[PDB]
Design a protein around this ligand. Structure first.
Ligand SMILES: N#Cc1ccc(N2CCNCC2)c(F)c1
Ligand SMILES: N#Cc1ccc(N2CCNCC2)c(F)c1
Length: 460
């Protein structure tokens, strides 16, 4: 039984509009409809992992699990194992995996975040799942963000609360939020960003959709434009959208968008919009390739169409040598030269670094850096040649070049992280000084940069 170096992952997001699904939803799991669709020749090939996010889901977990498993069994003739299911209000995440993966999957975590306060607390937020797949950490966030064309800022706030407070993955990674805890992080849901065009242009928008001419609409998609201005989802990717807006349809057809203001909408227009989205963030130089991104055309119980995305994702094996795990491997070391952090902070305190990696027995604290002023006002924290020599548990290059070092820069005064980032050990050379770089974030906002040189010694 060889361990895989690649898996495929299905991501689905559907706002079910508080209606039961139709009897057949197989088109969703087959990535068939509009957009970047999956080749017919793959229909019987199961994905390794299926992650299903619903919003406005009226079903019990039991009712939905039965529909999902029976759907996949009809497609694949495989009885999928339930990895996890977590529901907050009517927001749900289900993770299913091929039975051969049962022993490869461990450290399963679930959590939820409720967004807003009083008025704004009661139905929006996120659910999430994480786990290990052999040596690879996977996270999944299904969020239902604030609705309404005039609330993009609220949505961006919801995003930041979710990434700050969703507690998934390795708790030992205490300085790091979910945007740094996983080899691969998929974030999807009814993110509720709208096409921000005048109300009077509704029929023009519909015309453009019927012509499959999305360019003039996507140029006003609030998620793309907010991402472009680094207001939200910084360092996440999204595949090009080549499918029609997935909201707001008349139910039981896909022929009609229902956009006009109604008492039932709070007298808000719902111009056709790409509310339903899949984004990802993977550690640097890990294989991740989107192989489908689209919407179904034949599932019409909701005022949203289901969205699918599929990915090839690189994975690593659970490595054992004569030495680590359970000791260091003296044949391995990670050295840092000419390193400095550049920080946006207006504060003057001393800083130190923490290095966190599953290639280390535990995290490593550096000495304090030396603060200097940058030529354009910035705080520069010089580590020069002072950073420690890191001692990985395994020196085999087939292991070590697949690893990553998370970096937090912390205040000596408060022990609070001012910035977090990640460095790949997938180097062009070993025993060679090579440039390294990561942006630093805190609460998912850019706070600085870390750069320098690395010298990696493996047993080869
Ligand atoms: N596919 C799969 C799969 C793998 C592991 C678990 N479990 C749950 C919590 N207890 C121990 C581990 C599971 F439910 C499903
Ligand atoms: N409209 C738009 C838009 C275009 C580009 C980006 N970026 C740059 C490339 N890398 C990250 C994504 C973006 F966020 C939004």
């Amino acid at each position: 039984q060889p361990e895989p170096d690649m898996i495929t992952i299905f991501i689905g997001t559907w706002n079910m509009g508080n209606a039961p699904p139709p009897k057949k939803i197989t088109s969703w799991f087959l990535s068939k409809g509009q957009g970047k669709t999956r080749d017919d020749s793959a229909d019987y090939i199961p994905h390794d992992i299926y992650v299903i996010g619903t919003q406005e889901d009226p079903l019990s977990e039991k009712e939905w699990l039965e529909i999902l498993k029976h759907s996949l069994q009809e497609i694949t003739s495989v009885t999928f194992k339930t990895v996890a299911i977590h529901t907050l209000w009517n927001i749900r995440i289900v993770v299913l995996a091929k039975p051969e993966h049962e022993n490869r999957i461990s450290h399963i975590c679930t959590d939820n975040v409720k967004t807003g306060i009083a008025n704004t607390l009661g139905n929006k937020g996120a659910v999430g799942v994480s786990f290990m797949f052999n040596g690879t950490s996977l996270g999944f966030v299904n969020s239902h963000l604030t609705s309404g064309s005039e609330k993009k800022l609220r949505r961006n706030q919801n995003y930041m609360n979710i990434l700050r407070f969703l507690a998934l993955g390795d708790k030992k990674l205490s300085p790091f939020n979910i945007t740094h805890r996983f080899t691969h992080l998929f974030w999807f849901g009814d993110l509720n960003y709208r096409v921000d065009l005048p109300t009077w242009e509704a029929e023009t928008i519909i015309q453009k959709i019927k012509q499959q001419q999305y360019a003039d609409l996507l140029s006003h998609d609030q998620l793309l434009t907010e991402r472009r201005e680094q207001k939200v989802f910084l360092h996440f990717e999204e595949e090009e959208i080549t499918f029609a807006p997935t909201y707001r349809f008349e139910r039981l057809t896909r022929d009609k968008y229902a956009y006009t203001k109604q008492k039932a909408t709070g007298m808000k227009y719902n111009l056709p919009s790409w509310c339903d989205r899949v984004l990802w963030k993977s550690y640097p130089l890990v294989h991740v390739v989107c192989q489908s991104y689209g919407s179904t055309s034949d599932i019409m119980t909701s005022d949203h169409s289901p969205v699918f995305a599929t990915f090839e994702a690189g994975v690593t094996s659970q490595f054992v040598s004569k030495n680590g795990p359970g000791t260091v491997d003296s044949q391995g070391q990670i050295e840092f030269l000419r390193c400095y952090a550049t920080l946006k902070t207006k504060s003057q305190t001393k800083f130190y670094l923490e290095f966190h990696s599953s290639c280390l027995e535990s995290f490593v604290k550096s000495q304090e850096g030396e603060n200097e002023e940058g030529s354009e006002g910035e705080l520069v924290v010089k580590f020069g040649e002072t950073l420690p020599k890191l001692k990985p548990i395994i020196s085999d290059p087939e292991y070590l070049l697949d690893q990553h070092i998370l970096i937090s820069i912390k205040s000596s005064d408060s022990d609070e992280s001012y910035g977090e980032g990640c460095i790949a050990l997938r180097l062009e050379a070993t025993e060679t000084q090579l440039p390294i770089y990561t942006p630093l974030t805190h609460h998912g906002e850019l706070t600085g940069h870390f750069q320098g040189e690395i010298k990696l010694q493996t047993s080869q």
